Write a protein that binds this ligand. Structure first.
Ligand SMILES: O=C(/C=C/C1CCN(CCc2ccccc2)CC1)NO
Ligand SMILES: [K+]
Ligand SMILES: [K+]
Ligand SMILES: [Zn+2]
Length: 640
């Protein structure tokens, strides 16, 4: 399977610049490329990426997305003097030309195609192209907003033509609306385009009516354009995550793209003079991470904007850290999106309910100088995942997993056995040695990250796992439990939150438990995904645990989704998750280790839309919990 991450960059694309004064374009500088690549080098991330050379987009490739007339006129700019380049620039909105910009434009476009080829030829799993000029504003016959050619549109057109792709997701998290991309694909259901952007009721550039939430596509492409306008500046991590959990991710996993392309502008990051938003660079580590289980990880991140040379470097690194599989930073202080964001979110959801399953219950009333902390260090664990299979069972393990028991810890198991258990089943007592040994390696060391242990007795294993974590001390523990029955977990001191996926409808009282009973049947897979994206993830992120404890009991149905959840849930607790599998099940154990270890998640494909009973159940849980956990909100709250 493909491994590694490409980094496509070339110093030549920094060799064009503004040659006259124009405060509109004053901010698009060569140093954005220089600073971004030099920050990747400073943090050791460039050295870990497969360098892939830049190339020029050919004339035929340029014409996938642009007209002959426009290409001919741009082809003349290398021969123009400064006076002539200014006259040519003035024909377009917020764009400057330079004797070398045509050359660099073909490089920025060729680099994107180099990226697309390396990912689709399985030479790498994913990658990033640092390019200049940006693309997403470019249109079929015009330059616009610093863009000459539409790099990301090329990539989707080229991947369609050269790899026969039917479904391509484009995620545009730049702070500006990528109207060039939207115009490109508005009638094309094969390309799904998502963009959030500073709109301010159309008063922010490029001031377009069709940048609003109501542009859902045209014709056969209706429903494959999703605009989320930001009508206030200052949007926070919670707004960005609320957009992902309640708009982008539900749509993207139902669409099931064969390739993901990110228009990665970082002007949506704190400190940027254009975006004036407040999201920390670390949020881009999660934006990337939450998209990585799509399309078996085939993700092409293409740089667009980003103008604060400092927030720029830190967001590029956070993105590449996640592309490389490094553990995610903990995001603290999450809560409800602001009212403006919930308004935009609720309006997109409503207008899109005609087109997407995860929104369809909405349609019938039966169913309805700036400073911030420098990001902490992210270092890959030397051994990522520890595994403890049943005694004697050896398994073919990924190159970053080991099998598990010191006398020091063997003392601890005696101490616990003497007080709380009596227990003499000397096998269970090995389970407890394993849990403690794995947990100690997970939290004490930065060279083991997570782990899975097979166990026989759930309650004693769960108890010591939980009690040993709560005493390290891990401030908070998220517990995710697939099974029925009550476990020895006391989730009423604020330190534990319990997600339980069961088969019997059990009323839960208090707001530190989320219990989901999904009616059995073929629709079980889609219902689980809907609760994962819309409930489990929003709560888990607000909760912000220091350890995640997964628990599966021997009583299959889970095998189709367990890998997505294991992958997504590693956005919490810096990836520190300990999974207890009750009984042996080589396939469940292989899948868990594979997702724990950072491998690609195989796609879900086409799923039967979820049962309405399950969607009423999950909206009842959201009603019951969103007042405590504001990140669950996807509507504006009732003003009393
Ligand atoms: O990063 C991008 C392009 C971002 C551009 C958009 C257009 N404004 C210029 C608008 C302006 C600025 C100052 C005075 C008068 C007008 C600059 C930034 N897209 O992702
Ligand atoms: K955008
Ligand atoms: K489209
Ligand atoms: Zn931008």
């Amino acid at each position: 399977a493909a491994s590694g991450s490409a980094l496509i960059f070339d110093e030549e694309m920094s060799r064009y610049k503004l040659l006259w004064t124009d405060p509109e374009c004053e901010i698009e500088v060569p140093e954005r490329l220089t600073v971004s690549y030099e920050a990747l080098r400073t943090h050791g991330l460039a050295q870990r990426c497969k360098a892939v050379p830049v190339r020029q987009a050919t004339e035929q490739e340029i014409l996938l997305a642009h007209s002959e007339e426009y290409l001919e006129a741009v082809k003349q700019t290398p021969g123009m003097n400064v006076e002539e380049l200014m006259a040519f620039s003035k024909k377009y909105n917020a764009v400057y030309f330079h004797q070398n910009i045509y050359h660099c434009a073909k490089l920025a476009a060729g680099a994107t195609l180099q990226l697309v080829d390396s990912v689709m030829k399985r030479e790498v799993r994913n990658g990033m192209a640092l390019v200049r000029p940006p693309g997403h504003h470019s249109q079929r016959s015009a330059a616009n907003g610093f863009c000459v050619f539409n790099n990301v549109a090329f990539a989707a057109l080229y991947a369609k033509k050269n790899y026969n792709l039917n479904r391509i997701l484009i995620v545009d998290w730049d702070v500006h609306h990528g109207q060039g991309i939207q115009y490109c694909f508005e009638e094309d259901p094969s390309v799904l385009y998502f963009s959030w952007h500073r709109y301010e009721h159309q008063s922010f550039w490029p001031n377009l009516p069709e940048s609003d939430y109501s542009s859902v596509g045209k014709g056969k492409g209706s429903g494959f354009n999703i605009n989320l306008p930001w009508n206030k500046v200052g949007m926070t991590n919670s707004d960005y995550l609320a957009a992902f959990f309640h708009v982008l991710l539900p749509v993207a996993y139902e669409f099931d793209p064969e390739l993901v392309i990110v228009s990665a502008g970082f002007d949506s990051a704190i400190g940027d003079p254009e975006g004036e938003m407040c999201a920390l660079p670390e949020i881009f580590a999660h934006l990337t991470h939450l998209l990585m289980p799509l399309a078996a990880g085939k993700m092409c991140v293409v740089l667009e904007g980003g103008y604060n040379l400092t927030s720029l470097g830190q967001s590029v690194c956070q993105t590449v850290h996640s592309l490389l599989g490094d553990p995610t930073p903990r995001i603290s202080g999450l809560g409800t999106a602001c009212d403006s964001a919930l308004e935009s979110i609720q309006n997109v959801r409503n207008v899109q309910s005609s087109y997407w399953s995860s929104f369809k219950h909405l349609a019938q009333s039966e169913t309805n100088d700036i400073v911030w902390p420098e990001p902490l260090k992210r270092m890959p664990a030397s051994v990522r995942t520890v595994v403890v299979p049943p005694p004697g069972v050896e398994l073919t393990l990924p190159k970053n997993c080991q099998h598990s028991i010191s006398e020091s810890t063997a003392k601890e198991v005696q101490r616990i056995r003497d007080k709380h258990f009596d227990l003499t089943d000397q096998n269970i007592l090995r389970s407890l040695g394993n849990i403690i040994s794995v947990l100690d390696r997970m939290m004490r060391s930065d060279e083991v990250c997570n782990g899975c242990v097979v166990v026989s007795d759930l309650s004693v294993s769960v108890q010591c796992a939980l009690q040993h974590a709560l005493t390290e001390p891990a401030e908070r523990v998220l517990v995710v439990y697939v099974g029925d029955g009550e476990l020895p977990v006391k989730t009423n001191d604020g330190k534990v939150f319990l997600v339980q996926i069961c088969t019997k409808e059990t009323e839960d009282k208090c707001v530190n438990r989320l219990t989901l009973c999904l009616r059995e049947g073929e629709s079980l897979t889609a219902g689980f995904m809907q609760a994962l994206l819309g409930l489990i993830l929003p709560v888990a992120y607000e909760f912000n645990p220091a350890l995640v404890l997964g628990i599966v009991e021997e009583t299959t149905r889970l095998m189709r989704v367990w890998g997505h959840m294991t992958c997504l849930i590693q956005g919490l607790a810096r990836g520190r998750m300990l999974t207890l599998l009750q009984g042996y099940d080589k396939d469940l154990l292989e899948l868990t280790v594979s997702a724990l270890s950072g491998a690609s998640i195989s796609p879900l494909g086409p799923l039967r839309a979820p049962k309405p009973e399950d969607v009423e159940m999950m909206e009842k849980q959201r009603q019951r919990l969103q007042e405590r956990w504001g990140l669950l909100r996807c509507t504006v709250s009732e003003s009393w």
